[PDB]
Amino acid sequence: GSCRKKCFDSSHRGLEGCRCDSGCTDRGDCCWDFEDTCVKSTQIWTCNSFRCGETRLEAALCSCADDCLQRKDCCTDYKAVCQGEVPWVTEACASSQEPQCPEGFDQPPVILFSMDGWSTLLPNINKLKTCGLHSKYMRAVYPTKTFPNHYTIVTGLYPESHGIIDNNMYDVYLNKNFSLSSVEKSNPAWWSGQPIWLTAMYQGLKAASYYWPGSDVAVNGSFPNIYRNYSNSVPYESRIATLLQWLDLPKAERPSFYTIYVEAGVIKALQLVDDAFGMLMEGLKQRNLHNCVNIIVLADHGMDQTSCDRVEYMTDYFPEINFYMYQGPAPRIRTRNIPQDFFTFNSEEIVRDLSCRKSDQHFKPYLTPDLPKRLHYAKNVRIDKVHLMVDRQWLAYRNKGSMEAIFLAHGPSFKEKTVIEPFENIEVYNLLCDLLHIQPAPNNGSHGSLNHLLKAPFYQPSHAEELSKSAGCGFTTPLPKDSLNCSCLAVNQRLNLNRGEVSATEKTNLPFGRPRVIQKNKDHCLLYHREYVSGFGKAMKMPMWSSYTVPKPGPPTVPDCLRADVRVDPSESQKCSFYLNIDHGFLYPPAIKGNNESQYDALITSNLVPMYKEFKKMWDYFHKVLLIKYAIERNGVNVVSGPIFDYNYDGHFDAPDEITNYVAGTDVPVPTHYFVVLTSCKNKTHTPDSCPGWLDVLPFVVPHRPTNVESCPENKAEDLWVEERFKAHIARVRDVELLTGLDFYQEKTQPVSEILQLKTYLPTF
Numbered sequence: 117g118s119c120r121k122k123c124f125d126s127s128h129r130g131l132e133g134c135r136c137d138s139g140c141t142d143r144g145d146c147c148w149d150f151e152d153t154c155v156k157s158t159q160i161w162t163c164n165s166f167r168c169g170e171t172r173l174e175a176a177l178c179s180c181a182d183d184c185l186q187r188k189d190c191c192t193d194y195k196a197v198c199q200g201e202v203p204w205v206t207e208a209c210a211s212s213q214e215p216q217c218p219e220g221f222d223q224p225p226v227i228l229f230s231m232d233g234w235s236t237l238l239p240n241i242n243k244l245k246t247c248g249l250h251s252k253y254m255r256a257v258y259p260t261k262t263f264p265n266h267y268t269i270v271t272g273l274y275p276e277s278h279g280i281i282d283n284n285m286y287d288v289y290l291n292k293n294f295s296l297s298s299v300e301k302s303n304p305a306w307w308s309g310q311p312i313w314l315t316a317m318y319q320g321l322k323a324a325s326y327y328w329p330g331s332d333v334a335v336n337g338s339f340p341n342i343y344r345n346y347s348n349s350v351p352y353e354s355r356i357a358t359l360l361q362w363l364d365l366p367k368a369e370r371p372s373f374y375t376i377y378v379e380a381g382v383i384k385a386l387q388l389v390d391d392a393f394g395m396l397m398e399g400l401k402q403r404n405l406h407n408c409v410n411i412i413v414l415a416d417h418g419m420d421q422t423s424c425d426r427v428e429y430m431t432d433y434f435p436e437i438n439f440y441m442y443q444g445p446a447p448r449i450r451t452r453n454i455p456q457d458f459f460t461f462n463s464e465e466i467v468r469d470l471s472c473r474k475s476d477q478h479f480k481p482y483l484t485p486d487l488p489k490r491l492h493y494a495k496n497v498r499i500d501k502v503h504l505m506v507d508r509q510w511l512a513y514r515n516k517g518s519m520e521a522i523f524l525a526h527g528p529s530f531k532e533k534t535v536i537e538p539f540e541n542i543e544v545y546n547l548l549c550d551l552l553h554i555q556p557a558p559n560n561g562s563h564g565s566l567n568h569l570l571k572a573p574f575y576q577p578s579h580a581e582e583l584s585k586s587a588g589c590g591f592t593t594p595l596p597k598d599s600l601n602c603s604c605l606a607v608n609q610r611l612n613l614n615r616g617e618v619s620a621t622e623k624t625n626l627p628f629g630r631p632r633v634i635q636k637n638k639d640h641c642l643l644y645h646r647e648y649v650s651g652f653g654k655a656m657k658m659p660m661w662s663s664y665t666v667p668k669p670g671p672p673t674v675p676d677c678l679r680a681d682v683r684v685d686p687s688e689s690q691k692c693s694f695y696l697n698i699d700h701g702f703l704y705p706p707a708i709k710g711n712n713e714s715q716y717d718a719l720i721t722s723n724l725v726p727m728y729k730e731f732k733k734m735w736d737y738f739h740k741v742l743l744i745k746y747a748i749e750r751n752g753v754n755v756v757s758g759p760i761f762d763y764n765y766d767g768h769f770d771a772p773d774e775i776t777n778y779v780a781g782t783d784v785p786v787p788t789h790y791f792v793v794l795t796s797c798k799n800k801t802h803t804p805d806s807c808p809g810w811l812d813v814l815p816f817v818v819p820h821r822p823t824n825v826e827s828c829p830e831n832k833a834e835d836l837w838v839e840e841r842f843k844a845h846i847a848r849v850r851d852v853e854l855l856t857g858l859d860f861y862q863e864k865t866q867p868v869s870e871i872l873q874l875k876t877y878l879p880t881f
């Protein structure tokens with residue numbers, strides 16, 4: 117009596133002879149349900165009253181026919197609409213402590229989903245935040261652009277190592293230009309590293325991708341098992357349908373890993389992605405995979421903070437511009453005559469000619485090795501030596517003419533209804549390998565940092581083993597053999613600590629244990645003093661590390677007083693005669709703790725470090741003024757200071773053969789940087805030496821430069837720029853560990869996963 121199961125027929129059988137052929141419309145003969153059962157049905161992605169139980173239509177997008185579940189072509193809403201099942205979205209939160217996977221699903225699939233652009237508007241994505249796990253903000257690496265950041269996510273590498281350093285670049289060795297508009301975007305030579313899809317493939321699993329930076333590229337001569345060449349033409353429902361077809365594949369061909377990228381009427385648009393998301397969840401429920409699949413969603417909440425009013429122009433700084441400039445928020449300057457003049461180009465002159473030019477200046481030029489070490493944006497030919505650090509909300513241009521994502525995770529392997537602390541996206545790749553049970557390729561994340569996101573972590577982190585044992589530097593005589601051309605016109609026994617006195621300074625000044633030398637054949641020895649403990653590097657004739665616990669405060673430094681260390685061989689120690697531009701500085705501030713005689717333990721050749729006159733200014737101000745301010749704020753603080761040698765700017769400590777500059781006429785190396793790690797306690801009620809809970813860290817990797825041009829100190833007193841400079845060079849503990857070859861807190865009564873959490877936390881400013 118209607119169009120049901122009779123769509124396009126010579127049948128006159130109807131209500132009062134109503135028809136169901138395509139000509140019924142113009143005749144007015146259609147049965148009331150014609151359009152819905154026969155016409156709109158072939159063009160929607162959802163079942164309804166008319167479609168439930170329909171006779172299969174070939175022209176149709178999905179199916180609502182009785183055999184659609186067996187045929188695997190139902191619409192996502194089939195079970196809820198046609199079988200009255202409670203949809204995933206309305207259904208209560210899942211408690212699954214183990215993956216409830218269908219037969220064949222040996223290991224739960226991983227879906228990495230990225231979106232861009234409260235709750236009642238987006239119900240599906242909200243249910244995920246609600247039931248699952250979400251991170252406040254997910255820290256993006258420099259430059260903070262989407263395209264490189266997406267490749268970092270899947271590779272675990274910093275842009276300098278994976279190759280995609282910006283959307284636009286020129287490699288001199290290729291003599292090729294990369295841009296997203298170019299065919300060169302597809303050239304595999306640009307793409308370094310090993311993306312998660314390859315890792316899974318190389319390790320037996322199969323991987324698919326419905327768009328993601330580099331998934332439509334034969335990276336290391338291979339594409340993912342299933343991939344789609346980038347195009348914004350395809351509707352979201354068709355993408356989600358394909359994603360589900362891939363999961364409907366036979367075990368043999370069926371991928372274990374999936375990547376899917378998606379990019380007032382803003383809400384209308386967002387709702388379309390939430391609907392597509394809800395389609396994916398419904399599809400999974402209908403497959404019994406909703407409590408099997410581990411799904412991660414990244415929602416870039418980043419906004420364009422730029423304005424045409426907040427733009428800096430190079431025309432204001434140069435009378436003539438003959439250089440090429442990569443414009444915008446992370447600018448880079450190069451020669452126009454490429455490749456010919458690429459390495460000859462005076463990059464140093466450009467930084468100089470742009471340095472402290474205006475008082476209001478909304479950018480700071482840098483040579484890539486002088487850039488803040490935390491950024492890891494220097495070790496690649498693609499990264500031009502000239503780099504401009506533009507202020508937030510500002511842009512820099514030739515002439516007149518940023519990712520911040522919310523990490524969401526749902527699935528049986530993930531912790532339920534948990535808010536997790538912000539982390540860097542470099543960490544994610546190991547998590548992906550753990551979720552997939554594969555071995556991660558060498559990356560920059562620290563394995564086990566994100567174990568707190570997992571119900572049952574696949575990888576259990578372990579403390580790095582020391583490769584060099586401390587040796588020598590025992591107290592033999594209280595009088596030194598060689599004077600070392602040193603002078604103190606005004607004791608050495610105070611350097612002779614007994615087993616009990618040693619244990620006392622170890623308890624107080626090495627509360628989390630001593631840093632471990634993760635360096636092969638590095639000749640060192642520890643020196644024990646009442647107020648401090650240093651780790652003395654014999655070949656460099658200076659201490660690699662120095663440890664001390666400054667207690668909460670309630671005194672000048674002893675002048676013209678210096679003497680040889682009676683424990684350290686003259687062959688292995690610095691002489692006063694080496695100095696006379698670059699002068700000796702105290703790694704450990706002598707006046708920080710104790711009385712006038714406590715200072716004598718610090719007025720020795722073992723506490724001397726080579727410093728530029730201008731650096732010493734900053735160094736001394738921090739130790740005389742800023743440190744005491746912090747020690748009050750934090751109720752004591754454990755300070756670890758030390759030299760850093762990273763001449764090839766690869767973010768690791770230098771091998772001896774890598775150090776290029778020394779103190780004139782000597783073999784004492786000039787540190788490229790200095791580090792200061794402020795380890796105090798989170799619960800301020802306890803001092804750092806007596807803390808049971810978590811520690812609060814504050815690490816600095818400050819460049820050891822001969823002039824303070826960076827700080828632009830022009831007449832200003834230290835109270836105006838030194839702190840600003842120190843804060844400008846903040847970095848993770850792990851950043852230090854890498855640059856030094858030392859390993860911190862190997863004696864803190866917490867699991868390695870938890871310390872790895874702290875060693876990756878970057879302080880916010």
Ligand SMILES: *[C@@H]1O[C@H](CO)[C@@H](O[C@@H]2O[C@H](CO)[C@@H](O)[C@H](O)[C@H]2NC(C)=O)[C@H](O)[C@H]1NC(C)=O
Nearest residue numbers: 286290291292293439440451452453454455456
């Ligand atoms: C990469 O693109 C730049 C332009 O963006 C090209 O630069 C020109 O290079 C020649 C020498 O090779 C110079 O004489 C011109 O002055 C440059 N023009 C500009 C506007 O910079 C470069 O040739 C491109 N290289 C490749 C291989 O595509």
Ligand SMILES: *[C@@H]1O[C@H](CO)[C@@H](O[C@@H]2O[C@H](CO)[C@@H](O)[C@H](O)[C@H]2NC(C)=O)[C@H](O)[C@H]1NC(C)=O
Nearest residue numbers: 273274277278309492558559560766767768854
């Ligand atoms: C980030 O990860 C990669 C891989 O662990 C590191 O790059 C390697 O560095 C060493 C020393 O320069 C080279 O011998 C390797 O060939 C590099 N491998 C790759 C894949 O590029 C990189 O050093 C790490 N970054 C930091 C700051 O430690």
Ligand SMILES: *[C@@H]1O[C@H](CO)[C@@H](O)[C@H](O)[C@H]1NC(C)=O
Nearest residue numbers: 309310311314335336337557
């Ligand atoms: C490149 O692929 C080969 C096998 O095709 C493999 O041996 C090698 O480890 C891969 N390297 C990377 C970094 O992808």
Ligand SMILES: *[C@@H]1O[C@H](CO)[C@@H](O)[C@H](O)[C@H]1NC(C)=O
Nearest residue numbers: 302332339342343344345346
């Ligand atoms: C993608 O593009 C390449 C080159 O245009 C082509 O050979 C390949 O078949 C395409 N792959 C897919 C799955 O679209």
Ligand SMILES: *[C@@H]1O[C@H](CO)[C@@H](O)[C@H](O)[C@H]1NC(C)=O
Nearest residue numbers: 798799800801802808809810
């Ligand atoms: C801080 O310490 C006090 C006791 O000293 C205790 O009451 C409180 O719960 C502690 N909190 C944390 C987070 O350590």
Ligand SMILES: [Ca+2]
Nearest residue numbers: 762768769770
């Ligand atoms: Ca190095």
